[PDB]
Amino acid sequence: HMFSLITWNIDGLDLNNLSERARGVCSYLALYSPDVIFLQEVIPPYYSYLKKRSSNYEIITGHEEGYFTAIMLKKSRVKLKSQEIIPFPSTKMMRNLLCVHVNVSGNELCLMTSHLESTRGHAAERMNQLKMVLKKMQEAVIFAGDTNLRDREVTRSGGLPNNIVDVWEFLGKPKHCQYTWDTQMNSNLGITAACKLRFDRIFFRIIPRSLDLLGLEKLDCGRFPSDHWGLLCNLD
Ligand SMILES: N#Cc1ccc2cc3c(=O)[nH]c(=O)nc-3n(-c3cccc(-c4nnn[nH]4)c3)c2c1
């Protein structure tokens, strides 16, 4: 029938004006009203707002302390079958892989999210994190989350497998959503340098329809909802 999802690193560690940014993030989720949501970098206070505002979603957290990922499932349409938190081994940043087995319209496709290593120097540790993601996908599939991948690190990690495709590259490599982390346009960072990267990615095992950016409008306090852009992929 139809399907949608939203990946967004809400940047929950950035405590400044977070009460207003979280009211903007919710306002984006309310108008679009997706079926599945993949959030990264969520602090316990941030999880408290989404629990009270978005009352029609069954949230599954990846941890409890620090920051963690989160999956929100449209309770009216998506049914919970299973849920599991597979942690990364040699992770030095309190990071894990969050998978949830659901059933939408009678179809068996699981949902995954993660927040791979943020460190740029810890590239091999991130690439080893990438390999365990693709190895778990083939073992169950729609992955989505802050990957922090760049500079052909997917190539040097052995490349993507045949059964796993990237929704961006699969849609003819569209240009409007080429970069989810844009230090040029997004000025929540004050970075005088200009770099653009595609961090938030979406891997597929249903056919993806569209892909678009979220949170491009500055709020009333002059700051964006997040340093990352929100991703939105429709399907059928
Ligand atoms: N401020 C700033 C600032 C300006 C410019 C760049 C440019 C790049 C680039 O062309 N490729 C790349 O892969 N990463 C870049 N980072 C980056 C982004 C996140 C993290 C770390 C990082 N973490 N640890 N060391 N470096 C670097 C930048 C950061």
Residue numbers in the entry: 112 to 251, 257 to 321, 327 to 357
Provide the authors' original text about this structure.
Tyrosyl-DNA phosphodiesterase 2 (TDP2) {also known as TRAF and TNF receptor-associated gene (TTRAP) or ETS1-associated protein II (EAPII) } is a 5′-tyrosyl DNA phosphodiesterase that can remove the covalently-attached abortive complexes generated by DNA topoisomerase II (TOP2) when it is unable to complete its normal catalytic cycle. Fortunately, this type of DNA lesion is efficiently repaired, in part though the action of TDP2, which hydrolyses the phosphotyrosyl bond in a magnesium cofactor-dependent reaction, leaving ligatable 5′-phosphate moieties. Consequently, TDP2 has attracted interest as a target for small molecule inhibitors that might have utility in overcoming innate or acquired resistance to TOP2 poisons. Using a ‘humanized’ mouse TDP2 expression construct, we have now determined X-ray crystal structures of the catalytic domain of TDP2 in complex with deazaflavin inhibitors, revealing the unusual molecular interactions underpinning their mode of action.
As with the apo-hTDP2CAT crystals, co-crystals with 163 presented severe problems with anisotropy during data collection. Again, multiple crystals were screened before a dataset that could be truncated isotropically, to a maximum resolution of 3.4 Å, was obtained. Despite the low-resolution, which prevents detailed characterization of specific protein-drug interactions, clear difference electron density maps identified the binding site and general pose of this class of inhibitor bound to TDP2. The experimentally determined binding-mode of 163 is surprisingly different from that predicted by molecular docking studies, in which the pyrimido-dione ring of the tricyclic core, was hypothesized to bind to the magnesium cofactor–required for catalytic activity of TDP2–and made few (if any) hydrogen bonds directly to the protein. Instead, our data indicate that the tricyclic deazaflavin core of 163 unexpectedly packs against an extended hydrophobic patch, formed by the side chains of Trp297, Thr299, Leu305, Ile307, Cys311, Leu313 and Phe315, which lies at the mouth of the channel leading to the active site, more than 9 Å from the catalytic Mg2+ ion bound by the carboxyl side chains of Asp122 and Glu152. Significantly, the M7-motif maps to the binding site we observe for 163 in hTDP2CAT, where human TDP2 residues Cys311 and Leu313, along with Ala309, coalesce to form a ‘hydrophobic-shelf’ on which the deazaflavin core of 163 sits. Replacement of Cys311 and Leu313 in hTDP2 with the equivalent residues Tyr321 and His323 in mTDP2 disrupts this hydrophobic-shelf and explains the resistance of the mouse enzyme to the deazaflavin-based inhibitors.
